[PDB]
Amino acid sequence: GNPLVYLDVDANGKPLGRVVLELKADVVPKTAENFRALCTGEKGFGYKGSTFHRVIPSFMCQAGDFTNHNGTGGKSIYGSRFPDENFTLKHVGPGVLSMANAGPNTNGSQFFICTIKTDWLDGKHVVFGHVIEGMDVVKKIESFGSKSGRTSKKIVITDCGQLS
Ligand SMILES: CSc1ccccc1[C@H]1CCCN1C(=O)CNC(=O)NCc1ccc2c(c1)[C@@H]1C[C@H](N2)[C@H](O)CO1
To answer: What is the CA(113)–ligand 1 centre distance, in A?
Structure first.
């Protein structure tokens, strides 16, 4: 089966709630596993204590740079970067979970949760899951963003892990 993972998110030290994500290990097992292990922190590093560095209303919420905290970093459980597994899953609408990148075959740890259908990203960013519950929390994160992507509050992943 597919893993269920979670992100507990805060804004300036105040809890916003929980985002539960299904990771599509049935379609992209390598990409799903990388995200799963970064949530648990079982490799000695991961998302706990990192931020949503770029939040653009009516687009997406981007996070996962746990090394540089500015959008230039992060790393995968495999190494600094890994190939694009496939582009089978599409950016069909809000709640889609997909890999950020610096062009072809540059997946690391940065990811984004869509707040609209981002179909122009199909075949360019690897989709590997979706929001199961807590889309209201994603909308709360979205409200602290701007068209520049800059946030009005520091959005932190205070805790994360695996549910099943
Ligand atoms: C900016 S709004 C926009 C507009 C059109 C389309 C998309 C986007 C945004 C939002 C959706 C995903 N998205 C983006 O992905 C843009 N790109 C990066 O941020 N790139 C930074 C990055 C990420 C990941 C890795 C790196 C750099 C390298 C390579 C590798 N991973 C190593 O682990 C660390 O350094």
So the answer is: 13
For residue 21, indicate whether it is catalytic.
no
Beta-bridge partner residues of 5 = 21, 162
Does any ligand 1 atom lie closer than 6 A to the CB of residue 101? yes
CATH assignment at residue 12: 2.40.100.10
Residue 107 CA, ligand 1 centroid: distance in Å = 9
Residue numbers of the domain that contains 63: 1-164
Using CA positions, which residue lies closest to atom 23 of ligand 1? 101
Q: How many domains does the chain have?
A: 1
